[PDB]
Amino acid sequence: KTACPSGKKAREIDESLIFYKKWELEACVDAALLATQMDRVNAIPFTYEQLDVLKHKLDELYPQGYPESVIQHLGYLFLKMSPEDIRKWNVTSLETLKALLEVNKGHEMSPQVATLIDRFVKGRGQLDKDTLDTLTAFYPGYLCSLSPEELSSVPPSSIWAVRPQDLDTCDPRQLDVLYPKARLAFQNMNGSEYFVKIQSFLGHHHHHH
């Protein structure tokens, strides 16, 4: 079937659409309307197949990848994305990253979230302070999951996002990379605070009994 029943053409994304059959959603809901009103989808308890119809509509409308104007409102529909879907995204806002990471809370990192994080950080050109705040907030061992080579390109400003417990899983090679960056970043600290906060970057426990 390829024709919307009379009077069923959707002019809004609203609760009435939950009663539509799958083919009715396909024939009656325009993809541009859906994309424009993604901020209303997650409050509407569509079934899995209904949401699959909507996701396919977005895929059809955006073969080159959803725009961030839609991504920022995907919500739990993020869990229906494939890694390939996410590789096309250009995500620049940290509010979008926080919104997407919130719906994955309580679970291990999936390939989808890994792709999302990797593409976001590469798009910013570096791991900046606020991004590291967010990533650590959702994944405490993110910083020390990076190799020394990866850590070497982290700007010292981002050290201000590094909390002492974040360094527990780091080894002396990673800490050899991070400690000089921390020396530079804490230039403007008061002496007492500097002495306290610098210690975790030395990882003394790795070197004595």
Fold of 1-61: 1.20.970
Q: How many of the other CB atoms lie within 10 Å of CB of 186?
A: 18
CB 177 within 8 A of CB 148: yes
149-164 core/surface letters (b: 16 or more CB in 10 A; e: else): eebeebebebbebbee
Domain map of the chain by residue range?
1-61, 64-125, 144-209
**Long-range contacts of 147-155, Cβ-Cβ distance < 8 Å, separation of 24 or more:** 147/174, 148/173, 148/174, 148/176, 148/177, 151/177, 151/178, 152/177, 153/126, 153/127, 154/126, 154/127, 154/178, 154/181, 155/126, 155/127, 155/128, 155/181
Q: How was this structure determined?
A: X-ray
Strand runs labelled E in the chain = none
